[PDB]
């Protein structure tokens, strides 16, 4: 299972951001809104294949969550689909990026702005977000945003769709990695 | 689902499908409720889950 693949909670489907690790302990990042109120994660709709359980969740304000792997046999690739990921980096205006998500698959575009505030309503406001012209659709939450072999962010949300075009905001992945003391591999 | 606090400029991208009266499966209630507004109130909920 790798970046962009579907993950199932008891409520819905999201996408796996990046496989990360600390010592000998494997995790995976996803969106906070997705880890919020979720305990167990499975790799399929039938919920027969277990991935792990939520180890942290930060949402609103930020938009990242982490899941500890409890599955011992599932392959945990340090990639996004086939794309090898080797480091994480900070987004920059004009940077060219690619998002992979369980619903729309892969789409590319660029970073149009940083430190964006997104207001999802009823007090769910997220701050410090990367704005981009990349589309995304329901299912795609938490999937990766990368640039070449660099990890950049996690899909959080936006407007539009992939048919007519849209704007998607992403959580900086560096923020999550530091919070959890984990790193990409 | 009540779409009165809509519209909203943005939606998270998690998937929990709703089926609209246009026979379109909406990915989530946020997506579904913004469409109701854009439809100017003509679009309704058919049922929860995929169409
Ligand atoms: K969208």
From Swiss-Prot, chain A:
Keywords: Disulfide bond, Hydrolase, Protease, Serine protease, Signal, Zymogen. One of its GO terms (cellular component) is extracellular region. GO terms for biological process: proteolysis. Disulfide bonds join 14-34, 135-162. Coiled coil: none annotated. Its EC number is 3.4.21.81. The keyword Disulfide bond applies. The active site is at residues 33, 63, 141. It catalyses: Hydrolysis of proteins with trypsin-like specificity. The keyword Glycosyltransferase does not apply. GO terms for molecular function: serine-type endopeptidase activity. Belongs to the peptidase S1 family. Has a primary specificity for large aliphatic or aromatic amino acids. Monomer. This is Streptogrisin-B. It comes from Streptomyces griseus. The lineage of its organism: Bacteria, Bacillati, Actinomycetota, Actinomycetes, Kitasatosporales. The chain holds residues 115 to 299 of 299 of the full protein.
UniProtKB/Swiss-Prot annotation, chain B:
Disulfide bonds join 3-33, 11-30, 19-51. One of its GO terms (cellular component) is extracellular region. One of its GO terms (molecular function) is serine-type endopeptidase inhibitor activity. It comes from the Eukaryota. The record marks 13-14 as: Reactive bond 3 for chymotrypsin, elastase, proteases A and B, and subtilisin. Residues 1-51 form the Kazal-like domain. Keywords: Disulfide bond, Glycoprotein, Protease inhibitor, Repeat, Secreted, Serine protease inhibitor. Glycans are attached at residue 40. It is found in: Secreted. Avian ovomucoid consists of three homologous, tandem Kazal family inhibitory domains. This is Ovomucoid. The chain holds residues 135 to 185 of 185 of the full protein.
């Amino acid at each position: 299972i790798s970046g962009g693949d579907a993950i199932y909670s008891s409520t819905g489907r999201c996408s796996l951001g990046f496989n990360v690790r600390s010592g000998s302990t494997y995790y995976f990042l996803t969106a906070g809104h997705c880890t919020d109120g979720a305990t167990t994660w499975w790799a399929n709709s039938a919920r027969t294949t277990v991935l792990g359980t939520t180890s942290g969740s930060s949402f609103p304000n930020n938009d990242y969550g982490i899941v500890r792997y409890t599955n011992t046999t599932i392959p945990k690739d340090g990639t996004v689909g086939g794309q090898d990921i080797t480091s994480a980096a900070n987004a920059t205006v004009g940077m060219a990026v690619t998002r992979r998500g369980s619903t729309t698959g892969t789409h590319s575009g660029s970073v149009t702005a940083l430190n964006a505030t997104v207001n999802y309503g009823g007090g769910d406001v997220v701050y410090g977000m990367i704005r981009t012209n990349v589309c995304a659709e329901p299912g795609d939450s938490g999937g990766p945003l990368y640039s070449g072999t660099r990890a950049i962010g996690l899909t959080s949300g936006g407007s539009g769709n992939c048919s007519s075009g849209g704007t998607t905001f992403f959580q900086p992945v560096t923020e999550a990695l530091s919070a959890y003391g984990v790193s990409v591999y | 689902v009540d779409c009165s606090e809509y519209p909203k400029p943005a939606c998270t991208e998690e998937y929990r499908p709703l089926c609209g009266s246009d026979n379109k499966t909406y990915g989530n209630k946020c997506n579904f409720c913004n469409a109701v507004v854009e439809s100017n109130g003509t679009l309704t909920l058919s049922h929860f889950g995929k169409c």
